[PDB]
Amino acid sequence: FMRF
Amino acid sequence: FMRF
Amino acid sequence: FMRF
Amino acid sequence: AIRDVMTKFAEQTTMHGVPKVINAKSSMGRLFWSLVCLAAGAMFCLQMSEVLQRYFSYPKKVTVEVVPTPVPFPSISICNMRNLDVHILNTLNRMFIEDDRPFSNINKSEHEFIRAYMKKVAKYAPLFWNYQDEYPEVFQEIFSRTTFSANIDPEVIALAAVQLEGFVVNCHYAGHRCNKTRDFYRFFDPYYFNCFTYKAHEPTLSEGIENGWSSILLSGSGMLDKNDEIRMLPGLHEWRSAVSASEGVRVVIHPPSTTPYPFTEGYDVPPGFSASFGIHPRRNIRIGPPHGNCSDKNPFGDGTERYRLMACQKMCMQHYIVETCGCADVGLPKLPLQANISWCRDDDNFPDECMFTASEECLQLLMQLHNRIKCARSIKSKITKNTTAMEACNCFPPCDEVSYDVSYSLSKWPSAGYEGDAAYFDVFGIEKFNERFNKTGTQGKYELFTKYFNVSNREESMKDFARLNVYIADSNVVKTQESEDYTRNQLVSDIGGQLGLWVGISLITLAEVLELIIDLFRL
Amino acid sequence: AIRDVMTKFAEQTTMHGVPKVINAKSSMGRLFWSLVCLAAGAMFCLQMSEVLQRYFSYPKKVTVEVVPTPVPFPSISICNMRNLDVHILNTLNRMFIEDDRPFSNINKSEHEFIRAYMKKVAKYAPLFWNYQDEYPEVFQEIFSRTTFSANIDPEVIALAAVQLEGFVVNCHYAGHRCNKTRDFYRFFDPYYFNCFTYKAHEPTLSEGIENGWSSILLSGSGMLDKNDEIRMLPGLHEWRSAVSASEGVRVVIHPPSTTPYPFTEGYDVPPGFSASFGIHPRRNIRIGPPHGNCSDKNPFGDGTERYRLMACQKMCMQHYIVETCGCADVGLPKLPLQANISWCRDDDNFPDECMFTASEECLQLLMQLHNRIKCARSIKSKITKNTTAMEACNCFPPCDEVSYDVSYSLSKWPSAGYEGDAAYFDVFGIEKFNERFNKTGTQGKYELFTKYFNVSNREESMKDFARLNVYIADSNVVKTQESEDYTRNQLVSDIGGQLGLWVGISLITLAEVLELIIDLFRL
Amino acid sequence: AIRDVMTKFAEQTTMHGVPKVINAKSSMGRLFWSLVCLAAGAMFCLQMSEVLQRYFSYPKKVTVEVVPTPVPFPSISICNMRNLDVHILNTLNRMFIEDDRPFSNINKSEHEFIRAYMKKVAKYAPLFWNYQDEYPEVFQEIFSRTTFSANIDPEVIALAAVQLEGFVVNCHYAGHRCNKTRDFYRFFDPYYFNCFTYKAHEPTLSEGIENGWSSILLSGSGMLDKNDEIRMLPGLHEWRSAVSASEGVRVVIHPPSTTPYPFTEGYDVPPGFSASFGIHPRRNIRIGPPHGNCSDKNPFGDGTERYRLMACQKMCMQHYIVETCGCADVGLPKLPLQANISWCRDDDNFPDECMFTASEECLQLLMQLHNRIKCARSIKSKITKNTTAMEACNCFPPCDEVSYDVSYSLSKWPSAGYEGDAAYFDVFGIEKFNERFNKTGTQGKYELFTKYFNVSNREESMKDFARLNVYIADSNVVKTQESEDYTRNQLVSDIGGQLGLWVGISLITLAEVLELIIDLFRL
Ligand SMILES: *[C@@H]1O[C@H](CO)[C@@H](O)[C@H](O)[C@H]1NC(C)=O
Ligand SMILES: *[C@@H]1O[C@H](CO)[C@@H](O)[C@H](O)[C@H]1NC(C)=O
Ligand SMILES: *[C@@H]1O[C@H](CO)[C@@H](O)[C@H](O)[C@H]1NC(C)=O
Ligand SMILES: *[C@@H]1O[C@H](CO)[C@@H](O)[C@H](O)[C@H]1NC(C)=O
Ligand SMILES: *[C@@H]1O[C@H](CO)[C@@H](O)[C@H](O)[C@H]1NC(C)=O
Ligand SMILES: *[C@@H]1O[C@H](CO)[C@@H](O)[C@H](O)[C@H]1NC(C)=O
Ligand SMILES: *[C@@H]1O[C@H](CO)[C@@H](O)[C@H](O)[C@H]1NC(C)=O
Ligand SMILES: *[C@@H]1O[C@H](CO)[C@@H](O)[C@H](O)[C@H]1NC(C)=O
Ligand SMILES: *[C@@H]1O[C@H](CO)[C@@H](O)[C@H](O)[C@H]1NC(C)=O
Ligand SMILES: *[C@@H]1O[C@H](CO)[C@@H](O)[C@H](O)[C@H]1NC(C)=O
Ligand SMILES: *[C@@H]1O[C@H](CO)[C@@H](O)[C@H](O)[C@H]1NC(C)=O
Ligand SMILES: *[C@@H]1O[C@H](CO)[C@@H](O)[C@H](O)[C@H]1NC(C)=O
Ligand SMILES: *[C@@H]1O[C@H](CO)[C@@H](O)[C@H](O)[C@H]1NC(C)=O
Ligand SMILES: *[C@@H]1O[C@H](CO)[C@@H](O)[C@H](O)[C@H]1NC(C)=O
Ligand SMILES: *[C@@H]1O[C@H](CO)[C@@H](O)[C@H](O)[C@H]1NC(C)=O
């Protein structure tokens, strides 16, 4: 999951 | 003071 | 002595 | 009295073979000399047809030479390959580290650009959280620089883009220090958000390069945070592009009073290096419609700036993109006649519900935006290969053009040891660079630079700087001038030469035969 | 009746001075007018001789202009300056660390190249152990790359040289992703073992550079082992050579359907940098034997590929090397007519006993090989300065040639911080580069890359990559066309002009004097 | 008998319209034919005036072509951007660390340059201690390189500047090793204290580049001390200059037998990189005063070296500087006729008391020196823009000139791992570079290099080296030759063509009218  |  |  | 006037002209005429024909007593001699006269006339007609059509080819001629006339010093446009300011970027990163939800961060800053940026990103956060594993290539394209330059007011971006006082450490031209406020002119580019053009100002504080332009630029990214994990920061990257991820300065050397296009022209300089640009000026002069093709105006433009073929070609590409996809590419000039046309990357269509849900409608809108971008890029790549389309735009070369052949060169600017110590002192004790930011509006940047550029770590910190040297290597211009290859005077001369060589007639002899014809009339 | 026909022509002739001569009643007037007539005839003869010989100089003329016709996009050849694959090199190093005796290692690997490499090196191990202090310069030359490319089958080397899937991370042309299997063509070079040529494929998956060619290449050597001591690894180095020890990519931009020669042409790009190649196309047209020299075929070749002067010159050097030293240089094209000639670096003469003893016979063979190499190099350096030898090879310039003036530029590709994070993700999460090697045949390379390119060390690891951008900077070609300076038509015109200016004769007057001569015949 | 001779010429003349005029029986016909005759004569006069003046424009013509004639290999001048030797610099730094008072250090060294350097610096120490906060920009300019090159004997500086044996590690030309003593020629430059010119020596020890020039140069500054604080070291830095602080090699490629000017021409190479210079030779031939401007001699020079426009321009700038400021710029050639003129940076005026006191007299002398420098720099920057002044110096382009278009390229020379291990061994075990300094006069440098370049730190140490490759990329020269556009022969031909086309007269007819005039005389 690439978070912001 | 910039010394030499 | 350069070994291999 | 046909015979009458005939023999008159015969005996007093200046034309060569006709006489012998007219006075030939022998029958076989009359045959021979009629044959010769008509054969010579026929060959004269052949060669005249040849030469007349050669002139009608409106041919062209060219000359090349070195001349001592000096050209005006070129305009130098400098763009930092990083679009946003370092403090702004670190603020964005730290806000996302404190809370990764963009919706919550819209009210956590008074900076206009930050509020706009968070508002725009919030419209895509649920979609990104739900579908990034299925459509990574989509979100990587939506979150590119050009999208933000297409959806946020440039006057708002300009407050967060790289500033002149934080970009040009020092500047020198013709043995004098530059006045940055008067010599640098800011302009906006969709990829290089802020760019600056240096316009030369001749001497009316003596120091610096005596024979050219030299400046020290802050271009590295070493003071940005180094995260433990990959995190998505929209608006910084440009997915699958030639100038992506790069660090350094983009330099465009172009004639004065011309619009630069850093995304497809210019030279690159990495941080930590000193670049020398040896300018070899070239000038080309061209001739008009009949003898060739050239223009002194842009067919698509308002005529305010000097004409460059690039402007016409780019506006033609924009014309075709608008015609085909129904939208304009943000990476190309906006056609002056069509200010009402939306950019292809516009996203005002997105409902507010997309900030709270990942519904199919939001997804379909996302994919429609993606498809618009695909249409525009496809046309951009295809149309240049379509000679019919390009010829329909009437993009002829400039009638008077100055070109610059640039010799590139690199060296490591801040040398290790005492030399580099002197460089560091020049920047931080004499120019006192980091005190520019000791203001109410830039205190955080001041603290960042104070902690980063301290004395104990100069060998590493100084590698974020770059130096440019632009100088005219050759004092003499290489001129290249077109001209008409076959003048009307040369035509007249060669037709007369052929006329004398084949039949011996001169224009006075032409008046003579005209007199004979008028005599036949009088008879 | 000589006088008869004489006075006839006199009174009716169109020639200028002869009449007055023939009808001159006064004796002094006859003298004056004969003098004038013959003087004018003499000067006419002088100028005719001058002009006739000028035409016989078969002179030459040239024109230069910019034209809108587009050239085909150039073929781009990329060579990794490192010849062998990283996993293969680490395997060799670790085998020599486990046991430094090459003879023992011939059976320790199933890889064909490794077995051949150990077999070849074993023939020199005793000599190296016994004589390296006395003849270091000899062994440093024997153990060079070219020796191995000259003694091992290229089809065997190709299994250990750099592979396409491990070299080109990403590729884009004209707004579309490249199909590496269809667009890249592999070829073998004695120094750059594996090289690949990109042949453009126009649009029939939209992404990437819209107006050119861009690719990301793995070119660094950071993942190789770093030994505590200097160890001899034959076949990697090339002693005392211009392109030795270098790290990066060798780029050759050349017209399509032409053989590249990376060892003496092309441009270099270091790892960790992004290179921009601004292509300025140039075209030259040349004229044939009488008016000049040009060829459309290689005198030494089979005629399959387009002609470049380099091919003729290199094959001529090979011809002279074979003639003098009795062997061919591996660094030059093999003459098609002489496939039976051995390379100068061949070592099939060495007995098996040299794998077990350092006898004088083995030493003498070593020195004879060294002497062969010296002969070839001496001829290579000398022959270019020998204009007689070079002229004997009939290497005339191409009659139709496309040339590329390339503007070089560098920037630091993976920027520090968030931009570089996006770059790293693009490579390793979207393209998933390191999963290419998750196969039975490349498991070790997969593990190496997994341990090396991990997230925590991207700032250092990414500096092994390089990016190339090749684009056509100017849409208009600089044409340079030869032509004949003095046509037959211009000759005729100027001879007629001289004839009229000096004696007034026209070709009809030539028929007139022919009539007089025939009249003298009839008399 | 005016009428008499008139009608005689009339009936026997070869001129076209005059006859009909003279024999016109009809009055209206006489009017018509007089009108025609005079109209044709007038138009002939018009066109003759045009063509005669075009010839008097002494016009010019140019041709361009590729030719197989080889040019002599260029002279290559290499300058280390660091002026002083590393051991000397470390000695200076350590002396100032032991005792910061320069006056005390005049007797602490037997090295001549050190004694002179300390003596010179002592004259400014009290002023520096007392006024550096008030006039930093003054002391930064006084303590520049050029001041020391202007006040210390070059023969004394040469003992402390970079030495050839410590600069060129290896050299190769045309497949053979260079003899450094015979091929390199030392010359002094005010900024690059020591510079060396390579003059090619063709083959009469075979190794190295076969088709050009290649060398390995020590250019980095990594072995200098890294002080904890910024300390002032005069004579190393050059305040506010384009080539300041830089690390690398300055390369000038110029024709043989010409003086180089590294401060305003040449290319730069950073340490740790391998630079490839693709030389594309160009030749220009020019014509003399009437048809153009060119010179084969320097108006200011002694004529010993080949003429380059740069020499004339620089000596002209020196002339104007001497005329205006009463002193000569050390950064420009010394005018041969004016050896008595002092440099602008001379400081022999300073009393000894300035070594002990900071009195106003010493301060005023300091500011006067500063003002002299300002005057010289102002004139340097202004005068080039003053076309009157530049034209007064008669600096015409060379009549026969060879120019080199250089294609630049960079790669990382010592590759990581085994390749770099081979490079390191080649330098330090075969060439045995660090043993050059195992002498009584260089023991300290030997120890420094032994501790620095040891095996365990080669990956970092080797990045102080740079490699240059200079080779001729194209065997064929691009010639560019001027010529006269309108010859006397072409003039005669075209005047004759016009004469025949408008009035029909030939030079024999000119003799005819001369006969008529002489007949009128006889009458
Ligand atoms: C030069 O800069 C000074 C200081 O910012 C400013 O006051 C002055 O107006 C500038 N000169 C111009 C803009 O011509
Ligand atoms: C000039 O442009 C027209 C099209 O506008 C083209 O037909 C013609 O061939 C061109 N001529 C030259 C000399 O470029
Ligand atoms: C070229 O452009 C014209 C006009 O846009 C279009 O009609 C034609 O189909 C295009 N051809 C190609 C091959 O793109
Ligand atoms: C920054 O400004 C404050 C006053 O607002 C001053 O006290 C401080 O000394 C300044 N910083 C420096 C480095 O001088
Ligand atoms: C100087 O800055 C570096 C970062 O560039 C930092 O690591 C170091 O601790 C700083 N030193 C001091 C004394 O603040
Ligand atoms: C393109 O690549 C795909 C996947 O490797 C392959 O199946 C296809 O044949 C290629 N297209 C060609 C070779 O024309
Ligand atoms: C053409 O080549 C021949 C040798 O093959 C040479 O003698 C002649 O001078 C050359 N002429 C030109 C114009 O290059
Ligand atoms: C030049 O080459 C010819 C033919 O190979 C040879 O006869 C002659 O001796 C050579 N001359 C030199 C100086 O190498
Ligand atoms: C490599 O392949 C194996 C199956 O052979 C698979 O289990 C593994 O997940 C793959 N590696 C990665 C990183 O997906
Ligand atoms: C990542 O790779 C580097 C070498 O490039 C290595 O030193 C480091 O230990 C690795 N980190 C992890 C977590 O594997
Ligand atoms: C070449 O170098 C050697 C060794 O320094 C020297 O003895 C010889 O004189 C040199 N050759 C020359 C200077 O021609
Ligand atoms: C040659 O130089 C003179 C001045 O010395 C100048 O007046 C003239 O115009 C120049 N002519 C050309 C063709 O350069
Ligand atoms: C140009 O130079 C001349 C001679 O040195 C001088 O008289 C004139 O004033 C100068 N003009 C300018 C604008 O510098
Ligand atoms: C340096 O010279 C001395 C003799 O003066 C010698 O003993 C020593 O071995 C030399 N250094 C090296 C590395 O050989
Ligand atoms: C090798 O030199 C480096 C400096 O370049 C030094 O730090 C290191 O201690 C040296 N190693 C040895 C074994 O002397």
Structural overview:
The complex is a heterohexamer, with three copies of chain A (4 residues) and three copies of chain D (523 residues). Chain A is low in regular secondary structure and 4 residues long. Chain A is 0% helix and 0% strand. The radius of gyration of chain A is 4 Å and the shape is rod-shaped. With 523 residues, chain D is of the alpha+beta class. Chains in contact: A-D, B-F, C-E, D-E, D-F, E-F. The structure holds 2-acetamido-2-deoxy-beta-D-glucopyranose (15 copies). One 2-acetamido-2-deoxy-beta-D-glucopyranose binds at residues 179, 181-182 of chain D.
In whole angstroms, how far apart are the ends of chain A?
10 Å
Structural class of chain A: little secondary structure
Radius of gyration of chain D (Å): 36 Å
Number of strands of chain D: 14
CATH domain class of the largest domain in chain D: Mainly Beta
Largest sheet of chain A: none
CATH fold assignment of the largest domain in chain D: Acid-sensing ion channels like fold
Strand content of chain D: 15-25%
What small-molecule ligands were found?
A: 2-acetamido-2-deoxy-beta-D-glucopyranose
CATH architecture group name of the largest domain in chain D:
Sandwich
Estimated helix fraction of chain D: 25-40%
Detail the topology: elements first, then pairings.
The complex is a heterohexamer, with 3 copies of chain A (4 residues) and 3 copies of chain D (523 residues).
Chain A: no helix or strand
Chain D: H1 2-12, H2 17-22, H3 27-56, E1 60-67, E2 75-80, H4 86-98, H5 112-122, H6 125-131, H7 136-142, H8 145-151, H9 154-157, E3 168-173, E4 176-177, H10 180-183, E5 184-188, E6 194-198, E7 212-218, E8 249-254, E9 267-269, E10 273-285, H11 309-325, H12 360-383, H13 387-391, E11 400-407, E12 410-412, H14 418-430, H15 443-452, H16 458-461, E13 465-472, E14 477-484, H17 488-502, H18 507-522
Bound molecules: 2-acetamido-2-deoxy-beta-D-glucopyranose (15 copies).
The site of one 2-acetamido-2-deoxy-beta-D-glucopyranose (NAG) has 2 residues of chain E, from loops.
PDB class: membrane protein
Keywords: Neuropeptide, membrane protein
Assembly: hexameric
